[PDB]
Swiss-Prot record:
Superkingdom, taxonomy of origin: Eukaryota
Binding sites annotated in the UniProt record for a beta-D-galactoside 1: 43, 56, 60, 70, 77-83
Subunit architecture: Monomer.
Induction section of the entry: By toll-like receptor ligands zymosan (TLR2 ligand), polyinosinic:polycytidylic acid (poly I:C) (TLR3 ligand) and lipopolysaccharides (LPS) (TLR4 ligand) and by pro-inflammatory cytokines IFNG, TNFA, IL1A and IL1B in mesenchymal stromal cells. By IFNG in macrophages. Up-regulated in dendritic cells following infection with dengue virus. Up-regulated in Kupffer cells following infection with hepatitis C virus. Up-regulated in plasma following infection with HIV-1.
Annotated function: Binds galactosides. Has high affinity for the Forssman pentasaccharide. Ligand for HAVCR2/TIM3. Binding to HAVCR2 induces T-helper type 1 lymphocyte (Th1) death. Also stimulates bactericidal activity in infected macrophages by causing macrophage activation and IL1B secretion which restricts intracellular bacterial growth. Ligand for P4HB; the interaction retains P4HB at the cell surface of Th2 T-helper cells, increasing disulfide reductase activity at the plasma membrane, altering the plasma membrane redox state and enhancing cell migration.
Identification of the protein by name: Galectin-9
Organism annotation: Homo sapiens
Compartments reported by the entry: Cytoplasm; Nucleus; Secreted
Limits of the Galectin domain: 12-143
Recorded name of the encoding gene: LGALS9
Tissue specificity comment: Peripheral blood leukocytes and lymphatic tissues. Expressed in lung, liver, breast and kidney with higher levels in tumor endothelial cells than normal endothelium (at protein level). Expressed in trophoblast cells in decidua and placenta in pregnancy (at protein level). Isoform 2 is the most abundant isoform expressed in endothelial cells. Upon endothelial cell activation isoform 2 expression decreases while expression of isoform 3 and isoform 5 increases. Isoform 4 decreases in pathological pregnancy.
Shown part of the complete sequence: 6 to 148 of 355
Lineage: Eukaryota, Metazoa, Chordata, Craniata, Vertebrata
Length: 143
């Protein structure tokens, strides 16, 4: 059972030991920084390059607050899935949980379902989690 990453520095890249598995939970506990920019991202990808991101979760404190989800494949982005809600507040730590399922990721914010994102590329091929942008991390954990 994988040990958590404690206070990882941002921008962060870490192996997921099993790779994703149906039933796996990944918890990201962090805080958006005030007056340090307007977006951050959590990426589930294959390897460390950044060119093949199965699931890009991208909150943007712009235009009212919204979040974009997308997939990148061979360094081309597909169609964005936007949600016009900002479930994060600057200065407030959040628990952002990703549950892997057969057909989708379920994304919870403090336990409440935020977005469901259907796999565009096979979940089993994901072996890496990455965070970047305007956020400070406290931990990333696995169950």
């Amino acid at each position: 059972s994988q040990a958590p990453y404690l206070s990882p520095a941002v921008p962060f890249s870490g192996t997921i030991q099993g790779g994703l598995q149906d039933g796996l939970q990944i918890t990201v506990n962090g805080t958006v920084l005030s007056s340090s920019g307007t977006r951050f991202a959590v990426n589930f990808q294959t390897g460390f390059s950044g060119n093949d991101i199965a699931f890009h979760f991208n909150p943007r404190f712009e235009d009212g607050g919204y979040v974009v989800c997308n997939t990148r494949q061979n360094g081309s982005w597909g169609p964005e899935e936007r949600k016009t809600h900002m479930p994060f507040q600057k200065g407030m730590p959040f628990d952002l949980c990703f549950l892997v399922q057969s057909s989708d990721f379920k994304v919870m914010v403090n336990g409440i379902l935020f977005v469901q994102y259907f796999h565009r590329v096979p979940f089993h091929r994901v072996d890496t989690i990455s965070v970047n942008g305007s956020v400070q991390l406290s931990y990333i954990s696995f169950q």
